[PDB]
Write a protein that binds this DNA or RNA. Sequence first.
RNA 1: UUCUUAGUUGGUGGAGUGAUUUGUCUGGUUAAUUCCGUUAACGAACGAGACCUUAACCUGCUAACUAGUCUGCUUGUAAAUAA
Lengths: 338, 64, 228, 108, 143, 192
Amino acid sequence: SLDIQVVKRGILEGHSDWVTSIVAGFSQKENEDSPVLISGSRDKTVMIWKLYEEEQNGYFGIPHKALTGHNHFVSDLALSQENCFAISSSWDKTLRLWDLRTGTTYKRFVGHQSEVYSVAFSPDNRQILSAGAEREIKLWNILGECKFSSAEKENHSDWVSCVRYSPIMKSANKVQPFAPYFASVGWDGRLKVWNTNFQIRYTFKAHESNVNHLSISPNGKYIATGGKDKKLLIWDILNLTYPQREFDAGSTINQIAFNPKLQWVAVGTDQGVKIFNLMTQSKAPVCTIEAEPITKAEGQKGKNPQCTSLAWNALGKKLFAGFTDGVIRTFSFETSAN
Amino acid sequence: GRVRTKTVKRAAKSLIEHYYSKLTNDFHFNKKILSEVAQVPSKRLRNKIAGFATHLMKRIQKGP
Amino acid sequence: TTRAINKKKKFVADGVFNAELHSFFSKSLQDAGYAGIEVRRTPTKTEIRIKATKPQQVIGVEGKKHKELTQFLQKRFGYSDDQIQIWAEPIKFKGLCASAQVEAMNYKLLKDVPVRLAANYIIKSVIQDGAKGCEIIISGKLKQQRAKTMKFKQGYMICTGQPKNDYIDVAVRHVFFKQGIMGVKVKIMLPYEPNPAKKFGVKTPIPDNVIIHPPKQITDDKEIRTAV
Amino acid sequence: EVKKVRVRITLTCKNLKSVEKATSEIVSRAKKTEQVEVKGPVRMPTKTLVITVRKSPCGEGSKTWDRFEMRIYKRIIDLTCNVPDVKTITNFRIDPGVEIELTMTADQ
Amino acid sequence: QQKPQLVQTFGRKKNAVAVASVRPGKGLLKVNGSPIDMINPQILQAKIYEPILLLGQQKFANLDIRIRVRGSGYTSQVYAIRQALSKGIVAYHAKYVDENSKREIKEQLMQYDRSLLVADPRRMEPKKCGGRGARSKMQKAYR
Amino acid sequence: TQPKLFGKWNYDEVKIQDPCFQNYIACTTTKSQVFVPHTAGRYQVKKFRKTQCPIVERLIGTLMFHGRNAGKKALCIKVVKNAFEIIHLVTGRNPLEVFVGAVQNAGPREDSTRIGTAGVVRKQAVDVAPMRRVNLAIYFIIKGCRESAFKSMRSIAETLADEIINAEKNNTQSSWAIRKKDEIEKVAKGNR
RNA sequence: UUCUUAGUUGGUGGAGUGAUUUGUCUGGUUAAUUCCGUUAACGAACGAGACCUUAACCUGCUAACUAGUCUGCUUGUAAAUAA
Ligand SMILES: [Mg+2]
Ligand SMILES: [Mg+2]
Ligand SMILES: [Mg+2]
Ligand SMILES: [Mg+2]
Ligand SMILES: [Mg+2]
Ligand SMILES: [Mg+2]
């Protein structure tokens, strides 16, 4: 057997409610580690984390700056390439541009109506993409002006849950055969793929229930898609009649994340976090349920927390899961191969 | 005095009846779901309906 | 400016003006169904819209009642002839106006037409015009020297709540007989009208109505990579 | 012949809806014109006239009281303009219970 | 305009309001432009000294804090001052220090008293007719 | 630094023994060590919240009574601190240890009540809860205070101090609180 | 004023020659004929609820010389980038 076992790293706490979004630093000079962690939660707060080198006590790190601009929950965060800037989606019908050194909000994006579930940052950093319960995807100048809004003929029924982008690697030698696209996942169970011009390129009806999250392989060759459908769908951008691969992950799918290198898929689920190996065909490579540190409070027992977010650090060695109890948990992997 | 009324329980029944596949254990989700799905004249009302419907989602998860 | 007046004292004075008008018009206009009065106030002018069922009697025979009225307001307050303007506006649905209908049964009861029949006639009219529900109360000596109170309901009726003030329209009249004053109330609960498109009913629904709206199945074409 | 004139619009109304209609289309209309600078809606404190009245026209024994309110909403809007622009921005229909007062301070 | 190093917090009990402004330096506490020493009923000065002693003077020697209080009557006023001060330090440690310190002073304070960071929701009750007060009513004769 | 009550009295020296009272008398907690007896607390919104109120504040509450004194708290804070001073001048130990001692030591355990069962109506022998035991203790102590100090020259601080000391000492002559306590417990024993 | 108590009707079915009755109840439960359940009753209307006004939360939004804050100038008492 190839055993992939998990060593517990630590605990990042002080998020009052849920942990809805997590982003880790971009690798700046190549193959070097990311010092930076940012989370977003219900709690009305964006947390900036200063990380311990080793682990002291049971903790992996300590809260550095708490960004407060927001009325309702923070749905999703995204980083600039600079790593010096972050952005916040919210149910408060607004987006925010955050300087990461100062607590300062730079500009805020207004003009969304209902509420905002996700945001994406384009590789050029001059385009912001935002989506919400308006069944609408919006394109913003970094100066805070709505540039475009996808219309009825294209846009999908119910709510856009998540929008993301299609990485173009640095070297041209990294083999980019396709066109640039952006992907939109929804509560109608539709995975959409649009060109830069906001023209529908490929819209497949992926799921039977609703889709909470979508992420793209670092290669931009495949898409991972998931929600209440209790199914993890992997799609080849070459042949779409049939989904590339499918996995059964217990109960409901909250988040999905590709290992920036390692070629695994980590899935945030109510039961816990599952990790899939794409290199072999088997259905459950590493499974983590987490008992509650808040349960250690005397007399109160948990049903377990459910994990509301995932992120990998740039090196792909560390993994962060945001939870129901407002605690981020950190885990590392040791390989024992028989 | 927290007993819930006719209007609210009829409402909750209906909301689950048509929408069960869309509905979550989270109140805050279900209240927005309701808002989109229905005509509810009050904030207060909608919230009561959503709360009871949530309650019933949890009761459904357990059995009949 | 004329005089600097207390925003409070001015506004109360404006309301008292309005009420004096309403008493004046309900009193002197008693034959054509009179409903309401709407007053716009310009530094130049004062515009009065008399909302009524039978505008034709507000005007009269080539402005006999109109000119009379206009001049009455003139002598009463003092006004320039350019300063006063009276319009009469029709109420498109007579069945949704109470004061009107109570004037109707005032009339019918003067002609000795029996109670239940008259009440029924108007009620049937009111619901014919689309009102959800109506009620009429007649009080006083009917039968004999000992006072009676008779209620007539049909359709849907609310009494209590803020919705009362919205959906329910009420008017009373004193009716005169050789025997004394008898009196008559009409409560028309109005219907619910969701669009500004018409002057009808109530723009904001009863807080009770909870309507769930079941999902649809529509045209779906996907976009898929071809296989060769 | 350039005129820089600061215009003071005071709106008073017993109904709120009416006054916010007035306010917000004045702000909308003023912004729509280029010669114009708008110091926005200024909301005065809300004036509540209360009259507490005994119900029964008689001494009939239980004392009941009626709390009779009239609210007066007062708004202020400020403009930087010339005469014709003012008369452009005042050009729209307004609900009856509205008082509109205009004052002009010259500015150099 | 040169944005100052200022932090401004408010605090509340009944009709009383305290605005405390916090800036770095040699620590003063001046309430309405005067030392705590002179606050009117002497007894509850210790109420204001409470969060100070709880956190230790070491946090307060680094900061000049000036609290202006206008409000209802003596006691509520004292409570407002308390509040504004307390959450004032917290806001400082939020902007100018690490978040961690904000957290641990928050916990530190609230374990002692929650009235420091959270306001008393109570306000007066209006009077129901037929009584000398907001519940009690005109005496009744049954027999 | 551990706050001392009024600044001169250390809470750390007060230890409660009888296992009924430890949950019912405040001073054990970080939250109950207060320089000033004045919390402006919400102690009455729920059934047992009164427990979490500092005992000296409780006493102060009981003191505030009669139409003329209603709602003058400062007066009673004074009275209490003074009485506590006179206490340390007499005994010489923590006026708190004396107070707490005297709340514990004086209040009823048995009390008699009418329990209707079918035809039976007559007094019956009933046991007193911890919370009521405490409440009553304070009620009594202070009522004795008032009755005595009324037209005399002795002030309330004095009367109250006298009472607190006698109350811990168990004195059935000098302590009104214990006069009533014993009287009640006797009524009760007789009614079994 | 009963009484702010929680009451009151009708349609179609069931029972009485009939006035009438069931519905509108043993029992839980609620502040509430509020609900649950029982159920020759099934569904509904009024009343209660829903509603509306005031008070309590927003270091987020929209703004304010008929609110305040700060910033920079100054003035007074002071050795005064103190107060
Ligand atoms: Mg008095
Ligand atoms: Mg029948
Ligand atoms: Mg029958
Ligand atoms: Mg029969
Ligand atoms: Mg009956
Ligand atoms: Mg029924």
